Design a protein around this nucleic acid. Structure first.
Ligand SMILES: [Ca+2]
Length: 68
DNA sequence: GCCACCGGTGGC
DNA sequence: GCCACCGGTGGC
């Protein structure tokens, strides 16, 4: 389920998806959804989309929390 | 053509 | 040996 992510700017949501088949079955992937609905799979991709005005240095992609 | 899904690996 | 990061792609 897509859950609100207050660590991000307004509108952002986070989803954890459990892999269903293959040797990695049971592994989790984390996705973030922009307010406009675009999907992001890594902190570099996320940071490039948001740009310099948003400080993600303390941002922990896997947990979705600021981890300082 | 798109994209959800799993596999591969460079850097640590 | 692990995993952040992203490539390949089958099913639509
Ligand atoms: Ca916020």
């Amino acid at each position: 389920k897509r859950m609100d992510c207050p660590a991000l700017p307004p509108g952002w949501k986070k989803e954890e998806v459990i892999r269903k088949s293959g040797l990695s079955a049971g592994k989790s992937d984390v996705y973030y959804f922009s307010p406009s609905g675009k999907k992001f799979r890594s902190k570099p991709q996320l940071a490039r989309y948001l740009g310099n005005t948003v400080d993600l240095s303390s941002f922990d992609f896997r947990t979705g929390k600021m981890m300082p």
